[PDB]
Amino acid sequence: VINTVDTSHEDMIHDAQMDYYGTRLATCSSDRSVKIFDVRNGGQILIADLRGHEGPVWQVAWAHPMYGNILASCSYDRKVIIWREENGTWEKSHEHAGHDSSVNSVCWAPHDYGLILACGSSDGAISLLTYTGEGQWEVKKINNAHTIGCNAVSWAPAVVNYIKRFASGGCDNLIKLWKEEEDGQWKEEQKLEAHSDWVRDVAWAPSIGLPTSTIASCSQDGRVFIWTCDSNTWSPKLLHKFNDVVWHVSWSITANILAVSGGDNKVTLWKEQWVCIS
Amino acid sequence: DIACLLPVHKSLGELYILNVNDIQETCQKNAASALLVGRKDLVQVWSLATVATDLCLGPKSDPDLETPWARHPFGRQLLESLLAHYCRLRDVQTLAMLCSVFEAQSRERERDQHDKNKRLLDPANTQQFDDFKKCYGEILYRWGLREKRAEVLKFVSCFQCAICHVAVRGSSNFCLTCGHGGHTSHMMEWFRTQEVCPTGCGCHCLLESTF
Amino acid sequence: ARSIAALIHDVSFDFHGRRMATCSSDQSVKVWDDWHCTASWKTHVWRVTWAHPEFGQVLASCSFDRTAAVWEEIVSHWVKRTTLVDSRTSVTDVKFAPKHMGLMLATCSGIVRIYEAPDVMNLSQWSLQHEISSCISWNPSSSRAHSPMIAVGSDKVQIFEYNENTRKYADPVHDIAFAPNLGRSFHILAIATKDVRIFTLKPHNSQVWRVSWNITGTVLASSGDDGCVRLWKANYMDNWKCTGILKGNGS
Ligand SMILES: [Zn+2]
Ligand SMILES: [Zn+2]
Ligand SMILES: [Zn+2]
């Protein structure tokens, strides 16, 4: 169906991620606010309006309800504010400002790994806020992650302890796949370099059990690359060369349909060669 | 809402049933549910599974007794081909549900090899089947059918009561503030009307536990 | 009256009176819980009586094979965690002790094998903490001023009380039953013999059979060879009097 949700924002929207259950929608805009709507049963109810950022908010990401309904937001103010429910109202439970530049991407770790928030900032460093309990977060910043600055971070589904890995896409014209060593430190495992411009979004395809890890990335040049791992070997396959800049890429729940949104103010859905559905 | 573009349907997940006690009955119920939904290929696959999962086809302990139905082409080869086709279609729901249905039923080196060959699911590929089951449970949790998710995940390879004064061995509710508790049904019945602790300690257990 | 479906050697209620244990003449004991047989056991049963529910749904069976089987709750065909087969002679009856005195079972064969289980959760071990050498009756008194007492009948009633100072217990009779006290200062004794006898202990015209006391120990049911289950009760003068006659066949 169609659920036209009036954003009621004071500026242009930047992200819109719905909750895990598919009942609540959270959006962010340049007005330095992140108001969380309720879109249950085709409605537009403002559960809570949040204003704690000193600048525009780029991306938001809901957390798994198994660790509670928690929303994290990364803004231009080089600070990441983690919002949590407290007796039915949203409040800023924790704030992280360990980056010297604006944080552009935040994505919660898979529920199997735990409650880890991977923040990718433009300073070139990535920080992972691991929840140690009792309202205490442990930050293991990976300094100098990107040559210029990381613009996208995407976790990978739990595949076999757990070999925690995620894909980072920044302005270094390449994608860095980070692996969590047994000691605890995070080091790059493999570097993927096929884009000719700044990488804007990376989205690891959710794994359903197929022995094939799939990575979808988009860059500033307008090219969308699909990476597959049949080994740690990745063979990119150019999905399409869009006319304008491509902003975000998102996989389906079964990782068969990829949602590609670019600067042409259009949204395209691609299904497997890759053929557009829209 | 673009669920029509996905290989997983919420209606199919809600309509599916799981009972390890009787596999043919659950397979027939799943076939009926697929017919109600309208997916003919699911109907054919479920009827084939209904036929191929009957207890009359039980693998024998002795390898020399007969050829196990898994080694029969309509056994593992059918199931392997169906799993490959549904992996190509990326149908997580059907893959995991079929794996659960077929796993519910399920000289020394020769005996071990025979035990390996008598299973309609690959003993060396159980990690993939467990991954399918876990991912389908994740999708069911996404939909909200927690009971269905728990039922599917069951096939993954990996004090005295203060009301009736009967020893409690099963489900029990205990208040953390005061410490008096008993049978779950007894507490449900008692607290549906009153709000004071049955032991008489004066604790308002509803205001002390609920949240 | 209502002849519900079921030769039952002995039929007894549990504490709640919602489940009935019946010992058939074919050496079988069934838990007839509209009483429909919900269990089958093949026993190893002269008498089958339940235990207190807080101690578990334990049924004590006294057999003629010089043993006193105790079938413990393991859910249906209950598994014998314990087997009190140490009795030299056949156990005439097996009646559990009152819940206040712990898990004790009496098998008045004459050796009163009072088996005690220190571990309530693990009753598989039966310890003959006491052994005093037809009918076994337990005193339901739980008073601090009333010491526990064990009664033994011979086919004629002797009450052995576990004295605190020494920490040790110290017409043919068919069945002896002690009425529930409910705070009484005296005990009423009912003994099955050629004539029904009632006696007070204050600190059918034939061979009688297993008479029982109601939950309050006021109305009495005494059965004998006459085939009629006569109901008895007290009177305005605090004396035993007939209160009614019930027909076994249901007439
Ligand atoms: Zn209490
Ligand atoms: Zn209870
Ligand atoms: Zn309480």
XYZ file of C-alpha atoms and ligand atoms in Angstrom:
743
model
C 0.000 0.000 0.000
C 0.952 3.672 0.366
C 1.502 5.521 3.663
C 2.098 9.207 2.920
C 3.709 10.397 6.163
C 3.852 14.172 6.619
C 7.399 14.753 7.854
C 6.465 18.145 9.384
C 10.183 18.976 9.373
C 11.641 22.460 8.973
C 14.159 21.409 6.296
C 15.023 18.657 3.821
C 14.963 15.039 4.988
C 18.155 12.972 5.140
C 17.115 9.517 6.390
C 14.003 7.539 7.284
C 14.433 4.166 9.003
C 11.460 2.284 10.409
C 11.592 0.133 13.520
C 12.370 -3.576 13.709
C 8.708 -4.626 13.957
C 7.783 -2.307 11.092
C 5.515 -0.203 13.320
C 7.403 3.030 14.150
C 9.206 5.373 11.743
C 12.113 7.661 12.666
C 13.288 10.442 10.343
C 16.026 13.074 10.487
C 16.419 16.381 8.660
C 18.652 19.451 8.467
C 16.624 21.159 11.225
C 18.851 19.411 13.820
C 15.892 17.299 14.942
C 14.958 13.618 14.837
C 11.224 13.140 15.421
C 9.972 9.545 15.627
C 6.532 9.021 14.090
C 4.175 6.108 14.744
C 3.035 4.578 11.453
C 0.985 1.725 12.910
C -2.334 1.068 11.137
C -1.709 3.818 8.591
C -1.339 6.728 10.998
C 0.972 9.707 11.586
C 1.426 10.059 15.356
C 4.477 11.892 16.705
C 5.614 9.673 19.577
C 8.476 12.005 20.507
C 10.336 14.932 18.939
C 14.060 15.036 19.723
C 16.316 18.115 19.554
C 19.774 17.564 21.017
C 22.078 17.911 18.014
C 23.912 21.137 17.196
C 23.640 20.491 13.452
C 21.882 18.520 10.720
C 21.456 14.792 11.346
C 22.654 12.545 8.520
C 21.610 8.964 9.311
C 19.612 7.134 11.982
C 19.414 3.419 12.738
C 17.061 1.470 14.988
C 18.462 -1.117 17.390
C 17.193 -4.645 17.909
C 14.306 -4.855 20.420
C 16.018 -7.837 22.072
C 18.261 -5.132 23.558
C 15.357 -2.676 23.712
C 13.889 -0.108 21.340
C 16.901 2.195 20.956
C 17.621 4.737 18.212
C 21.021 6.212 17.349
C 21.646 9.339 15.282
C 24.787 10.777 13.683
C 24.825 14.515 13.004
C 27.040 17.183 11.463
C 28.079 18.383 14.945
C 30.675 15.560 15.179
C 28.559 13.997 17.942
C 26.471 10.817 18.069
C 23.479 10.834 20.430
C 21.859 7.518 21.362
C 18.150 7.815 22.172
C 16.323 5.276 24.333
C 12.810 4.869 25.703
C 12.165 5.604 29.384
C 8.585 4.930 30.539
C 7.134 5.662 27.107
C 9.144 8.779 26.217
C 12.339 9.202 24.211
C 15.388 10.685 25.929
C 19.078 11.112 25.140
C 20.663 8.314 27.174
C 24.234 8.580 25.864
C 26.245 10.929 23.660
C 29.533 10.211 21.885
C 31.761 12.925 20.410
C 35.073 11.114 19.989
C 35.423 12.111 16.327
C 37.031 15.351 15.160
C 34.649 15.650 12.180
C 31.006 15.008 11.344
C 29.756 11.439 11.742
C 27.939 10.370 8.580
C 26.999 6.702 9.097
C 25.758 4.681 12.070
C 24.579 1.069 11.954
C 23.925 -1.222 14.904
C 25.777 -4.522 15.038
C 23.816 -7.749 14.493
C 21.914 -8.897 17.562
C 24.051 -12.047 17.760
C 27.241 -10.014 18.235
C 25.715 -7.687 20.826
C 24.907 -3.971 21.100
C 27.697 -2.306 19.106
C 27.166 0.992 17.279
C 29.655 1.558 14.456
C 30.072 5.284 13.787
C 31.800 6.328 10.577
C 32.907 9.959 10.602
C 34.495 12.213 7.991
C 37.682 12.539 10.070
C 38.814 9.128 8.806
C 38.191 7.173 12.023
C 35.551 4.625 13.031
C 34.396 4.106 16.622
C 32.423 1.107 17.899
C 30.290 1.734 20.998
C 30.067 -1.668 22.686
C 27.448 -1.848 25.441
C 29.158 -3.228 28.553
C 26.036 -2.842 30.709
C 24.984 -0.539 33.543
C 24.702 2.343 31.078
C 28.408 2.208 30.191
C 29.757 2.176 26.630
C 33.245 1.024 25.640
C 34.654 2.791 22.572
C 37.417 1.186 20.489
C 38.178 3.880 17.923
C 39.881 2.722 14.719
C 41.895 5.827 13.876
C 42.976 6.547 10.289
C 40.389 4.105 8.937
C 40.065 6.064 5.676
C 42.511 8.245 3.766
C 40.150 11.249 3.782
C 37.068 10.176 5.736
C 34.621 7.304 6.152
C 31.130 8.014 4.815
C 29.461 4.601 5.180
C 29.676 1.640 7.565
C 27.666 -1.577 7.207
C 27.776 -4.577 9.529
C 27.750 -8.171 8.294
C 25.372 -10.890 9.525
C 26.697 -13.373 12.072
C 28.534 -16.111 10.153
C 30.823 -18.775 11.597
C 33.284 -17.479 18.707
C 31.949 -14.904 16.236
C 34.094 -13.424 13.455
C 32.750 -9.879 13.672
C 33.196 -8.084 10.348
C 31.812 -4.987 8.655
C 32.277 -3.058 5.416
C 33.482 0.552 5.522
C 33.130 2.900 2.568
C 34.785 6.310 2.652
C 36.343 8.950 0.424
C 39.518 6.884 -0.136
C 38.038 5.549 -3.422
C 37.977 2.059 -1.889
C 36.108 -0.212 0.522
C 37.862 -1.576 3.614
C 36.583 -4.822 5.134
C 37.446 -4.887 8.839
C 37.813 -8.069 10.893
C 37.753 -8.356 14.687
C 40.941 -10.128 15.755
C 41.046 -12.599 18.634
C 42.962 -10.066 20.740
C 40.176 -7.502 20.392
C 41.649 -4.858 18.109
C 40.079 -4.152 14.719
C 42.268 -4.398 11.616
C 41.454 -4.263 7.913
C 41.271 -7.709 6.308
C 40.723 -7.008 2.597
C 40.561 -3.772 0.608
C 38.076 -3.483 -2.264
C 38.927 -0.801 -4.844
C 36.653 -0.419 -7.877
C 34.878 2.942 -7.486
C 36.354 5.977 -9.235
C 34.957 8.522 -6.748
C 33.939 8.905 -3.101
C 31.973 5.928 -1.783
C 28.699 7.156 -0.279
C 26.941 3.984 0.904
C 27.813 0.350 1.548
C 25.227 -2.286 2.479
C 26.219 -5.853 3.325
C 23.523 -8.196 2.048
C 21.849 -10.139 4.882
C 22.887 -13.784 4.789
C 20.116 -16.387 4.717
C 22.559 -19.309 4.905
C 23.906 -19.189 1.345
C 27.703 -19.647 1.225
C 27.913 -16.294 -0.576
C 28.565 -12.961 1.138
C 27.235 -10.110 -1.003
C 28.254 -6.444 -0.753
C 26.438 -3.599 -2.511
C 28.108 -0.189 -2.684
C 27.470 3.154 -4.368
C 29.913 5.963 -5.099
C 29.928 9.641 -6.029
C 30.671 8.876 -9.698
C 27.235 7.262 -10.080
C 28.246 3.592 -10.319
C 26.733 0.845 -8.155
C 28.894 -2.242 -7.619
C 27.731 -5.657 -6.398
C 30.469 -7.674 -4.689
C 30.155 -11.431 -4.156
C 32.303 -13.928 -2.239
C 31.901 -17.497 -3.498
C 38.361 -17.582 0.549
C 38.049 -13.810 1.062
C 37.808 -13.290 -2.708
C 35.456 -10.617 -4.054
C 34.480 -10.225 -7.719
C 32.601 -6.950 -8.299
C 29.828 -6.856 -10.894
C 28.730 -3.399 -12.044
C 24.976 -3.250 -11.453
C 24.441 0.025 -13.335
C 26.128 3.339 -14.154
C 23.587 5.947 -13.086
C 23.536 9.398 -14.660
C 23.793 11.268 -11.342
C 25.352 10.622 -7.944
C 24.042 7.581 -6.061
C 23.377 8.139 -2.357
C 22.078 4.993 -0.635
C 21.817 1.264 -1.323
C 19.633 -1.111 0.689
C 19.045 -4.852 0.451
C 15.751 -6.686 0.757
C 14.891 -8.839 3.762
C 16.050 -11.880 1.765
C 18.843 -9.923 0.005
C 17.309 -10.372 -3.446
C 16.006 -6.859 -4.247
C 18.368 -3.904 -3.853
C 16.918 -0.437 -3.210
C 19.126 2.129 -4.960
C 18.486 5.831 -4.333
C 20.537 8.481 -6.099
C 20.818 12.208 -6.735
C 18.290 12.028 -9.586
C 15.472 12.210 -6.985
C 14.424 8.687 -7.980
C 14.267 5.302 -6.253
C 15.060 2.127 -8.200
C 14.650 -1.518 -7.190
C 16.993 -4.042 -8.813
C 16.530 -7.819 -8.827
C 18.709 -10.542 -10.318
C 22.521 -9.813 -14.592
C 20.603 -7.237 -12.545
C 17.403 -5.832 -14.063
C 15.460 -2.862 -12.722
C 11.953 -3.463 -11.390
C 10.763 0.149 -11.087
C 4.391 -2.334 1.409
C 6.176 -4.464 -1.194
C 5.774 -7.882 0.423
C 4.370 -9.081 -2.920
C 7.887 -8.648 -4.369
C 9.485 -10.901 -1.725
C 9.751 -14.714 -1.601
C 8.395 -14.703 1.981
C 4.717 -14.167 2.820
C 3.382 -13.294 6.265
C 0.148 -15.169 5.532
C 2.061 -18.375 4.781
C 4.049 -17.992 7.996
C 0.880 -17.495 10.028
C -0.897 -20.418 8.340
C 1.944 -22.944 8.676
C 1.825 -25.489 11.505
C 4.514 -27.522 13.251
C 4.039 -30.701 15.305
C 6.931 -33.161 15.537
C 4.530 -35.814 16.868
C 2.789 -36.192 13.486
C 4.669 -35.079 10.379
C 2.204 -36.233 7.710
C -0.618 -34.275 9.361
C 1.465 -31.092 9.480
C 2.549 -31.598 5.866
C -1.082 -31.972 4.769
C -2.021 -28.863 6.761
C 0.812 -26.934 5.098
C -0.378 -28.134 1.688
C -3.888 -26.901 2.501
C -2.490 -23.555 3.672
C -0.456 -23.197 0.472
C -3.565 -23.984 -1.577
C -5.442 -21.301 0.368
C -2.652 -18.791 -0.302
C -2.488 -19.738 -3.976
C 1.087 -20.920 -4.563
C 0.723 -24.079 -6.648
C 4.416 -25.003 -6.528
C 4.311 -24.939 -2.723
C 1.261 -27.214 -2.948
C 3.140 -29.704 -5.122
C 6.250 -29.564 -2.924
C 4.211 -30.049 0.254
C 2.329 -33.006 -1.221
C 5.649 -34.534 -2.308
C 7.027 -34.043 1.207
C 3.829 -35.521 2.674
C 4.410 -38.646 0.607
C 8.164 -38.775 1.252
C 8.030 -38.245 5.043
C 5.731 -41.130 6.015
C 6.906 -43.321 8.888
C 6.729 -46.369 6.594
C 9.995 -45.135 5.020
C 12.014 -45.207 8.245
C 15.725 -45.801 7.717
C 16.998 -49.119 9.037
C 19.867 -49.471 11.492
C 21.389 -52.342 9.504
C 22.937 -51.054 6.243
C 22.421 -54.423 4.528
C 18.688 -54.557 5.325
C 17.685 -52.281 2.430
C 18.574 -49.063 0.643
C 17.535 -46.063 2.782
C 14.965 -43.720 1.283
C 17.516 -40.903 1.557
C 19.708 -42.696 -0.992
C 16.588 -43.111 -3.129
C 16.464 -40.477 -5.909
C 13.073 -39.268 -4.658
C 14.704 -38.701 -1.263
C 17.871 -36.649 -0.874
C 18.188 -35.917 -4.602
C 14.631 -34.564 -4.684
C 15.210 -32.578 -1.501
C 18.625 -31.333 -2.634
C 17.221 -30.211 -5.995
C 14.293 -28.464 -4.292
C 16.651 -26.724 -1.863
C 18.904 -25.584 -4.715
C 15.919 -24.255 -6.672
C 14.545 -22.383 -3.658
C 17.999 -20.991 -2.864
C 18.062 -19.682 -6.433
C 14.610 -18.213 -5.764
C 16.009 -17.057 -2.377
C 12.866 -18.407 -0.655
C 14.092 -18.493 2.941
C 10.678 -19.496 4.295
C 10.240 -22.606 2.152
C 13.885 -23.653 2.544
C 13.849 -23.459 6.339
C 10.372 -24.965 6.675
C 11.273 -27.948 4.478
C 14.531 -28.419 6.382
C 12.645 -28.429 9.693
C 10.002 -30.848 8.395
C 12.578 -33.297 7.043
C 14.843 -33.011 10.104
C 11.967 -33.657 12.521
C 11.841 -37.307 11.443
C 15.631 -37.585 11.761
C 32.647 -52.238 10.327
C 32.372 -49.192 12.583
C 33.288 -46.890 9.691
C 30.682 -48.632 7.531
C 28.059 -48.146 10.251
C 28.941 -44.453 10.573
C 28.747 -44.004 6.798
C 25.369 -45.765 6.713
C 24.106 -43.499 9.499
C 25.291 -40.545 7.417
C 23.548 -41.779 4.258
C 20.185 -42.568 5.886
C 19.307 -38.907 6.571
C 17.334 -37.001 3.947
C 19.282 -33.899 5.036
C 23.028 -33.701 4.538
C 24.904 -34.476 7.786
C 27.880 -32.479 6.484
C 25.648 -29.513 5.536
C 23.760 -29.106 8.820
C 25.296 -25.666 9.410
C 23.493 -24.308 6.342
C 20.187 -25.829 7.478
C 20.628 -24.303 10.937
C 21.342 -20.973 9.237
C 18.101 -21.280 7.254
C 16.153 -22.041 10.433
C 17.718 -19.131 12.336
C 17.085 -16.695 9.484
C 13.461 -17.809 9.172
C 13.063 -17.333 12.917
C 14.487 -13.840 12.451
C 11.938 -13.120 9.707
C 9.127 -14.439 11.913
C 10.310 -12.185 14.746
C 10.284 -9.327 12.225
C 6.661 -10.152 11.404
C 5.789 -10.549 15.093
C 4.792 -14.237 15.240
C 7.017 -15.078 18.199
C 5.303 -18.433 18.778
C 5.928 -19.495 15.174
C 9.564 -18.399 15.464
C 9.990 -20.491 18.614
C 8.303 -23.481 16.957
C 10.575 -23.287 13.902
C 13.737 -22.879 16.000
C 13.004 -26.094 17.929
C 14.514 -28.056 15.015
C 17.925 -26.346 15.129
C 20.689 -28.931 15.481
C 22.671 -26.685 17.838
C 9.546 -24.115 46.569
C 5.924 -24.480 47.690
C 2.990 -22.598 46.191
C 1.526 -19.827 48.340
C -2.019 -20.476 47.053
C -2.623 -24.246 46.978
C 0.411 -25.244 49.107
C 1.409 -27.866 46.525
C 5.042 -28.360 45.537
C 5.787 -26.448 42.332
C 7.943 -28.174 39.716
C 6.890 -26.459 36.477
C 5.946 -22.921 35.476
C 6.012 -20.594 38.477
C 5.800 -16.867 39.202
C 7.863 -15.491 42.089
C 7.789 -11.897 43.329
C 11.278 -10.460 43.759
C 10.272 -7.902 46.401
C 8.632 -10.273 48.907
C 9.511 -13.779 47.707
C 6.167 -15.618 47.807
C 5.058 -17.411 44.664
C 3.536 -20.523 43.191
C 1.896 -22.059 40.135
C 1.420 -19.796 37.121
C -2.280 -20.585 36.689
C -2.900 -20.154 40.420
C -1.269 -16.716 40.456
C -3.133 -15.712 37.292
C -6.482 -16.650 38.838
C -5.636 -15.042 42.185
C -4.349 -11.761 40.728
C -7.161 -11.449 38.177
C -9.397 -10.487 41.130
C -7.251 -9.476 44.120
C -4.017 -7.473 44.288
C -2.488 -8.536 47.634
C 0.078 -11.301 48.022
C -1.600 -14.657 48.805
C 0.899 -15.344 51.606
C -0.459 -12.332 53.507
C 2.828 -10.417 53.688
C 1.023 -7.328 52.359
C 3.163 -7.003 49.227
C 1.317 -5.559 46.230
C 2.905 -8.002 43.810
C 1.312 -6.462 40.704
C 2.852 -3.060 41.447
C 6.123 -4.785 42.420
C 6.694 -7.140 39.455
C 4.650 -6.043 36.462
C 7.387 -3.739 35.044
C -25.697 -44.941 44.602
C -23.968 -43.786 41.413
C -22.049 -46.937 40.436
C -19.256 -45.339 38.435
C -17.102 -47.580 36.256
C -14.094 -49.176 37.942
C -12.295 -56.438 42.270
C -10.904 -53.330 43.970
C -9.047 -54.556 47.058
C -8.770 -51.013 48.447
C -9.933 -47.620 47.162
C -8.753 -44.433 48.860
C -8.887 -40.710 48.139
C -5.975 -38.303 48.096
C -5.770 -35.286 50.396
C -7.812 -33.125 48.008
C -10.292 -35.914 47.266
C -10.057 -35.341 43.507
C -8.056 -38.461 42.556
C -8.846 -42.036 43.587
C -6.303 -44.854 43.829
C -7.781 -48.348 43.512
C -5.925 -51.643 43.968
C -7.488 -54.339 41.798
C -7.599 -58.017 42.745
C -5.371 -58.788 39.725
C -2.314 -57.281 41.482
C -2.814 -53.902 39.805
C -3.185 -50.374 41.178
C -4.874 -47.612 39.181
C -5.267 -43.875 39.776
C -8.945 -43.439 38.876
C -9.219 -39.660 38.602
C -16.825 -39.175 36.293
C -13.992 -41.363 37.600
C -12.040 -42.581 34.564
C -8.962 -44.783 34.901
C -6.065 -42.460 34.066
C -3.221 -44.900 34.819
C -2.222 -48.570 34.776
C 0.570 -50.109 36.824
C 0.464 -53.940 37.218
C 1.618 -53.160 40.823
C 4.364 -55.684 41.725
C -1.606 -54.639 46.526
C -3.552 -55.134 49.753
C -3.780 -51.389 50.448
C -3.012 -48.336 48.298
C -3.201 -44.912 49.958
C -1.881 -41.577 48.737
C 0.654 -39.282 50.397
C 0.430 -35.606 51.265
C 0.547 -33.532 48.048
C 3.302 -31.212 49.300
C 5.504 -34.326 49.535
C 4.550 -35.376 45.995
C 1.821 -37.609 44.581
C 3.243 -40.782 46.116
C 1.104 -43.927 46.323
C 2.134 -46.616 48.813
C 1.196 -50.179 47.849
C 1.391 -53.045 50.345
C 1.734 -56.400 48.579
C 1.739 -60.037 49.666
C 5.264 -60.624 48.284
C 7.004 -59.443 51.495
C 7.397 -55.928 50.099
C 5.837 -52.464 50.374
C 6.173 -50.757 46.990
C 6.042 -46.959 46.807
C 5.261 -45.576 43.346
C 6.501 -41.985 43.124
C 5.311 -39.243 40.785
C 7.197 -39.412 37.481
C 4.873 -38.581 34.594
C 1.206 -41.990 32.417
C 2.937 -44.748 34.390
C 4.617 -43.549 37.570
C 8.150 -44.845 38.142
C 9.125 -46.482 41.440
C 11.929 -44.268 42.721
C 11.930 -46.286 45.960
C 10.969 -49.862 46.817
C 10.565 -50.719 50.515
C 11.083 -54.462 50.085
C 13.097 -54.975 53.287
C 10.069 -56.335 55.178
C 10.517 -60.030 55.960
C 6.761 -60.703 55.970
C 4.010 -59.472 53.675
C 3.049 -55.841 54.278
C -0.571 -55.812 55.449
C -1.002 -52.067 54.891
C 0.986 -48.974 53.917
C -0.249 -45.676 55.384
C 1.888 -42.547 55.227
C 2.641 -40.527 58.342
C 1.134 -37.043 58.783
C 2.915 -34.289 56.890
C 4.243 -32.583 60.030
C 6.420 -35.555 61.041
C 8.198 -35.868 57.689
C 8.150 -38.509 54.979
C 7.441 -41.656 56.994
C 5.591 -44.768 55.826
C 4.308 -47.534 58.100
C 4.034 -51.179 57.004
C 2.482 -53.161 59.872
C 3.241 -56.600 58.453
C 4.481 -57.208 63.081
C 7.629 -55.350 62.044
C 6.565 -51.692 61.775
C 9.077 -50.680 59.094
C 8.810 -46.924 59.561
C 10.855 -45.835 56.550
C 12.041 -42.219 56.675
C 13.365 -40.243 53.704
C 15.753 -37.442 54.765
C 15.763 -36.087 51.188
C 12.253 -35.094 50.115
C 13.358 -34.527 46.513
C 15.223 -37.871 46.458
C 12.897 -40.371 48.146
C 14.577 -43.372 46.478
C 16.326 -44.154 49.789
C 14.160 -45.495 52.621
C 15.745 -45.585 56.082
C 14.233 -47.700 58.870
C 14.675 -45.014 61.515
C 12.255 -46.962 63.727
C 11.258 -50.627 63.812
C 8.707 -51.883 66.355
C 7.842 -55.583 66.237
C -2.970 -56.256 60.416
C -3.802 -52.549 60.635
C -1.586 -49.457 60.771
C -3.081 -46.160 61.950
C -1.324 -42.800 62.173
C -2.142 -40.067 64.670
C -2.878 -36.827 62.775
C -1.867 -34.708 65.776
C 0.699 -32.035 64.931
C 0.665 -30.324 68.326
C 3.762 -29.287 70.242
C 2.048 -30.844 73.277
C 1.036 -33.994 71.337
C 3.904 -36.328 70.481
C 3.568 -38.322 67.238
C 1.997 -41.745 67.739
C 1.906 -44.894 65.601
C -0.851 -47.482 66.036
C -0.583 -51.151 65.048
C -3.503 -53.567 64.723
C -3.377 -57.352 65.010
C -5.797 -59.851 63.483
C -5.646 -55.164 70.042
C -4.323 -51.666 69.296
C -0.991 -50.423 70.663
C 0.090 -46.790 70.275
C 3.843 -46.164 70.132
C 4.906 -42.558 70.755
C 8.374 -41.265 69.866
C 9.325 -39.947 73.300
C 11.413 -36.777 73.120
C 13.692 -37.707 76.030
C 14.797 -41.036 74.522
C 14.296 -40.030 70.849
C 12.797 -43.488 70.260
C 9.320 -44.885 69.665
C 7.730 -46.464 72.738
C -12.539 -60.209 68.433
C -9.812 -59.710 65.825
C -8.823 -56.215 64.740
C -9.201 -55.596 60.999
C -8.661 -51.838 60.587
C -7.904 -48.978 62.989
C -8.566 -45.341 62.116
C -7.741 -42.181 64.057
C -10.169 -39.307 63.592
C -8.754 -35.926 62.566
C -8.391 -33.873 65.727
C -8.977 -30.283 64.583
C -7.677 -28.936 67.876
C -9.459 -31.517 70.020
C -8.079 -32.331 73.464
C -8.870 -36.028 72.933
C -8.485 -38.695 70.255
C -11.321 -40.851 68.909
C -10.326 -44.402 67.962
C -12.300 -46.542 65.506
C -11.340 -50.227 65.394
C -12.761 -52.793 62.977
C -13.652 -56.031 64.775
C -16.612 -58.366 65.272
C -18.402 -55.273 66.612
C -17.611 -51.671 65.713
C -15.894 -50.009 68.675
C -15.303 -46.308 69.342
C -13.018 -45.145 72.155
C -11.861 -41.763 73.452
C -8.242 -41.191 74.509
C -7.722 -37.924 76.399
C -4.142 -37.048 77.535
C -23.168 -55.041 60.858
C -22.839 -57.801 63.478
C -20.049 -59.403 61.440
C -16.367 -59.064 60.562
C -15.832 -55.324 60.061
C -13.529 -53.888 57.388
C -11.610 -50.714 56.606
C -13.538 -47.939 58.340
C -12.499 -44.385 57.502
C -12.876 -40.979 59.134
C -14.154 -37.903 57.328
C -12.035 -34.791 56.840
C -13.258 -33.483 60.220
C -13.513 -36.826 62.039
C -17.182 -36.489 63.000
C -19.221 -38.655 60.605
C -18.073 -42.282 60.480
C -18.351 -44.928 57.756
C -17.969 -48.482 59.083
C -18.168 -51.430 56.686
C -18.381 -55.122 57.481
C -19.306 -58.544 56.119
C -22.993 -57.535 56.220
C -22.542 -55.890 52.810
C -23.942 -52.515 53.925
C -21.759 -49.424 54.360
C -23.397 -47.979 57.481
C -22.755 -44.286 58.120
C -22.234 -43.324 61.767
C -21.868 -40.010 63.578
C -21.942 -38.379 66.994
C -25.060 -37.504 69.001
C -26.297 -34.623 71.140
C -24.772 -36.423 74.151
C -21.312 -36.657 72.505
C -21.878 -40.374 71.884
C -21.598 -42.491 68.753
C -24.907 -43.017 66.965
C -26.126 -44.320 63.622
C -26.578 -41.627 60.976
C -27.564 -43.638 57.891
C -27.123 -46.800 55.816
C -25.755 -46.891 52.266
C -26.190 -49.775 49.826
C -23.066 -51.167 48.195
C -24.903 -52.275 45.056
C -26.394 -48.779 44.714
C -30.000 -49.561 45.676
Zn 4.569 -11.957 49.387
Zn -0.213 -23.679 43.386
Zn 5.341 -9.602 46.286
